[PDB]
Amino acid sequence: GIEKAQEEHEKYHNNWRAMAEDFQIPQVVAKEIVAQCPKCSPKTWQMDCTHLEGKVIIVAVHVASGYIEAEVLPAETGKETAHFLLKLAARWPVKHLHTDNGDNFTSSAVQAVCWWAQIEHTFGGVVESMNHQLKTIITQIRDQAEKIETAVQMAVLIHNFKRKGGIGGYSAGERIIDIIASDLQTTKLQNQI
Amino acid sequence: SPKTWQMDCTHLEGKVIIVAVHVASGYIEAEVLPAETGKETAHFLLKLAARWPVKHLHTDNGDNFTSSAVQAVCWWAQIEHTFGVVESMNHQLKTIITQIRDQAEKIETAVQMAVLIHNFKRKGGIGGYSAGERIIDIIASDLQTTKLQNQISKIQNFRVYFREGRDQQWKGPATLIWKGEGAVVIQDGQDLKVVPRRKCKIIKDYG
Amino acid sequence: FLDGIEKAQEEHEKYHNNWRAMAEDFQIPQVVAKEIVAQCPKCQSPKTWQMDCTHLEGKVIIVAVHVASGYIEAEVLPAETGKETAHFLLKLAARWPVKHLHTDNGDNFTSSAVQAVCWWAQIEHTFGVVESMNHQLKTIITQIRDQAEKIETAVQMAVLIHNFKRKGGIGGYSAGERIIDIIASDLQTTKLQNQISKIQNFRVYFREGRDQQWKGPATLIWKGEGAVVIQDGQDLKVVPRRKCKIIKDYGR
Amino acid sequence: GFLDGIEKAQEEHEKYHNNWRAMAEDFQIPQVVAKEIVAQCPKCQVK
Ligand SMILES: [Zn+2]
Ligand SMILES: [Zn+2]
Ligand SMILES: [Zn+2]
After folding, report:
1. Which spans in chain A are helix H?
2. A67-73 and A55-62 as β-strands: parallel, antiparallel, unpaired?
3. What gap in Å lies between CA A113 and CA D4, rounded to an integer?
């Protein structure tokens, strides 16, 4: 397996995760194979903010499955963004966070929550497609709820558990549950063996 | 049951805390309400049903838990409501809150940090798992069972054109059963047979 | 069956599903679920390509990208005239189904040879992703440059590595699996639409229970072995075959 | 062929409003295209 991974990386320059999946190697060996070349993630969440009907909506997406999580904010300050990030870290296992060059994403409370929860913060085309789909669903079932917050939560429920799209024909919640369960079993077997 | 949740409300330092608990794993979601009306209870139940698959809700005979807003949200989300663990989880959450109280200014940060500590930093039980690993394992097992029973018919909905020995015409659309590496099992006229991989064409045939 | 149609109509009234999910869940045929979607008032591209040119080491590269999947086809041109761009467009239109082409307002893209190729191959040309794809292709070309002697071999090896060796996105697929899945879904939709019109060229007179009169002409939707699904008065109903008479309808 | 027959049958039904069996026997076109010529007229009904 190690010889096949070295030959495949010498030809095509693959990364370490795809080699460790396709050749069934422990990940540190593929990490050292990638690190020895001179020519050269189930816990990553991308966050963004948008405007709708005079409100501020903050949307976080789990990238490997398309799992959405939205909230209605009363302001665009840093304390409410830190509170939403703390709730997201307390609900799901979060390790890597991606944002854009914004205002509330560079703040003392946001850095304090990221330090306390040990999240790797990085700054910088999936989140725009998720926001576009969320806008279409919100305008589709707007006339069933009076408030805007209730319509946002119903659109999150419809997007997570009622839209069986893609190649495999799987919803988003089943995909994130299967991904984290398979990753936990893989880390357990690699820690035992 | 892998999809049963229980809800309760409590008081802490003059506030109102609402606690929902997944029973089979001891998984905790909690929030701080500014009141005890039916609208905030219906909004918390809607957020809980939008995040996780809730099918069976168990509550007591309270004041806000018997109302038109909670009834309408349960109708729209198709949740079965029953009236009669959570007190033990409430005492546990109060003890964790009093343990890390001197690290937070407001009570809301203390509630969310206690939820994170209880969900991912308290390993016990038999195998040595926390609550999040247990709820993910239970839901993954149940979903694997039901989707296996559907995916068998999904893989039997294909069509195979095969070739027999010493005849130069492609035979009719038999039904695929299993596709190996060097062999293909098909059912043709209620007869099971095994053909090599180089004598078959597997399509879906829209038409 | 009728319980499945009623549950599917209530589920679409609440959540506005698609027809593939309803056909898989409630075990109804695809034409009935497509009619349920087609009756909703609140519910009413796989063949678009973009082209561009660039320079690399004194050579003129031309890149064509399928937009909805990110699928790259590249070539090295000897010059930058209109006849070579028309030849590259004719090869691209001969290998993949191209129906809508998007370019910039260059010289060679505004030419009589390219206009004649678009006329013969029936392509809609529109003048204004590709710059990001040119950037990524040039990074791969500078990454594997030492394994080739000429520049055309390096361009084609970078195209192969981008198409089949780089994985990402939602499901973790490459570009080739994405373009094949997208075109196959569009093919399934067109075949189902042909069957829908061919079935809906009929008409049904049905007789209710405890009556001897024939009712109004309802439109046929699905003709089963023992059941018949008809639409009448914005309502779907299932009548058995021994109480129905199917006639042709010339009502264009 | 009978493609010019289809053109002349459309002109003849545009003037005189024939039926389909008469046009099928006169212009030697098949019965399906003759019934379609009658069907696409708003005033006539095939019977
Ligand atoms: Zn390398
Ligand atoms: Zn609809
Ligand atoms: Zn006429």
Report:
1. 2-12, 16-23, 27-35, 78-91, 108-117, 127-140, 148-161, 172-192
2. antiparallel
3. 81
> Min CA distance, C143 vs chain A (Å)?
7
Q: B201 at the A interface (CB within 8 A)? A: no
In a domain, B65, yes or no: yes
Show residues of chain B in contact with C187, CB under 8 Å.
Answer: 206
How many domains is chain B built from?
2
A54 at interface of C, judged by CB pairs closer than 8 A: no
Cβ atoms of residues D16 and D9 within 8 Å: no
- Give the phi and the psi of residue B89 in degrees, each rounded to 5: -70, -30
Is B55 within a domain? yes
Please report whether residue B207 resides in a domain. no
Q: Any known ligand binding at A146?
A: no
Q: Please give the order of strands across the beta sheet that includes C71-77.
A: C71-77, C59-66, C48-56, C100-103, C124-127
* C104 has a chain A CB within 8 A of its CB: no
Overall residue count recorded for chain A in this entry: 193
The interface residues of chain C toward chain D in range 211-250, judged by CB-CB distance below 8 A, are 250
CB under 8 Å to C238, separation ≥6 — which residues? C1, C2, C5, C227, C228, C229
Same domain, B189 and B101: no
* Rounded Cα gap, residues B75 and B59, in angstroms: 16
* Backbone φ, ψ for residue A2 (5° rounding): -70, -40
Cα torsion through C178, C97, A163, A159, rounded to 10 = 80
Q: Can you give the residue range of the structural domain that contains C116? A: 48-181
Within 8 A by CB and 6+ apart from C242, the residues are: none
Solving technique for this entry?
A: cryo-EM
Task: Look up the CATH number of the domain holding residue C117.
Answer: 3.30.420.10
